[PDB]
Design a protein around this ligand. Structure first.
Ligand SMILES: O=C(O)[C@@H]1C[C@]2(C(=O)O)C=C[C@@H](O)[C@@H](C2)O1
Ligand SMILES: [Cl-]
Ligand SMILES: [Cl-]
Length: 390
């Protein structure tokens, strides 16, 4: 598959110039991050990728920039002592950035080609291609994940209906927390309950709360049981083939949680994926897909109810669960006996609102959400629900 290998090669070419960018910046005592350059590159790209989703394209380009900076910081570390041979430094503006701008545009052509042909991405080819880069797994995962979303495209008249009846049917799971759940008073609570309410208020809508779940989520969506759904729903490619997504409202990735008393025997992916480790997981969502793809040796227990699954780690019946880092960090605080077992997340994942596939609904919801993330303290809402703002 020419198209895919060509796209991966052009991305590695971009990353391969970055030691040279770092030598220049080291020599001139310049920071790694140049935000003005970043914005110029991002705006050029979105204006040349209009047929692609702009949020996905910016995430994909942003992650290449994040990969580029990590590489540059690898080099900065090297250059303590060593130093740049000052006679070797290559011009950032005359030499290096024109080349990056050119690669930029070639990457764009190839995205357009892959999109049009419906290039089926192979995660195994990506990995083989990028394995040699000194880049942490989250960055490498984001590179592939956002690329895949950029490359996936039967709509509904959801907005038309809503503008008549003003009745926003909002699908919730009530098993996640901090996103959606019940207090021990019984009432719906979460980041997503409040998000959904603020969205209703500002559109002039009333909410019917429809109960869904991870195993029936997409089935419930295809049957048109809700109009949107919020419950810390991961934005994935598979979901986006059938449904739509808002702008992302949280960025993270999967980590491990287990008992503090076990952490030395479990603080590595290698140490966790052994025969003797018992993995517990909730059915039907990104937790399940992850551990099915990520693990070869560990036996996996399905635990149907996500509100009670952490009790199995506490009690000793399972050893580790892979889940969203924001969940792991909340449960590590709720339960003193538990700790997050890994240094850093293994994956890249964002939370977005699931939408029925109506592009006008998406435009309007995206406009509001991004306004909201600008204009209201999102930090304090997360925090209000037990999320340490870090
Ligand atoms: O100075 C630079 O040009 C390089 C490349 C980079 C990018 O990926 O485009 C753009 C801006 C900088 O913040 C980083 C990332 O260093
Ligand atoms: Cl997360
Ligand atoms: Cl999920």
């Amino acid at each position: 598959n020419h198209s895919e290998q060509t796209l991966y090669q052009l991305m590695s070419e971009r990353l391969a110039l970055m030691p040279e960018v770092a030598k220049y910046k080291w020599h001139h005592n310049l920071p790694i991050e140049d935000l003005a350059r970043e914005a110029m590159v991002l705006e050029r790209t979105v204006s040349r990728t209009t047929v692609l989703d702009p949020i996905h394209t910016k995430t994909f380009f942003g992650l290449q920039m994040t990969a580029a900076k990590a590489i540059q910081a690898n080099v900065f570390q090297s250059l303590t002592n060593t130093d740049v041979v000052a006679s070797d430094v290559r011009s950032l503006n005359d030499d290096l950035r024109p080349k990056l701008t050119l690669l930029g545009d070639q990457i764009i052509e190839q995205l357009l080609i892959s999109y049009q042909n419906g290039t089926p991405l192979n995660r195994a080819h990506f990995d083989a291609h990028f394995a040699h880069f000194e880049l942490n797994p989250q960055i490498k995962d984001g590179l592939f994940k956002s690329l895949e979303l950029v490359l996936t495209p039967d709509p509904r008249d959801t907005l038309a209906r809503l503008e008549k009846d003003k009745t926003l049917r909002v699908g919730v799971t009530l098993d996640y927390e901090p996103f959606s759940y019940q207090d021990n008073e019984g009432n719906r609570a979460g980041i997503d309950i409040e998000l959904a309410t603020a969205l209703a208020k500002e559109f002039g809508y009333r909410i019917v709360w429809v109960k869904t779940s991870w195993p029936t989520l997409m089935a419930d969506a295809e049957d048109n049981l809700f109009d949107i759904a919020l419950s810390g729903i991961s934005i994935t490619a598979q979901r986006q083939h059938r449904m739509m997504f808002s702008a992302p409202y949280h960025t993270g990735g999967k980590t491990a949680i287990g008992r503090c008393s076990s952490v030395d025997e479990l603080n590595t992916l290698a140490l966790i994926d052994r025969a003797e480790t018992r993995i517990i997981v909730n059915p039907g969502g990104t937790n399940e897909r992850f551990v099915r793809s990520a693990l070869t040796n560990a036996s996996i227990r399905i635990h149907p109810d996500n509100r009670t699954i952490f009790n199995e780690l506490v009690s000793g019946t399972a050893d580790a669960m892979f889940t969203d880092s924001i969940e792991a960090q909340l449960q590590a605080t709720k339960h003193p006996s538990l700790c997050v077992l890994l240094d850093q997340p293994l994956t890249f994942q964002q939370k977005g609102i699931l939408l029925q596939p109506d592009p006008e609904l998406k435009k309007r919801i995206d406009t509001w959400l991004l306004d909201y993330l600008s204009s209201h303290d999102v930090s304090a809402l997360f925090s209000k629900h037990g999320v340490d703002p870090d």
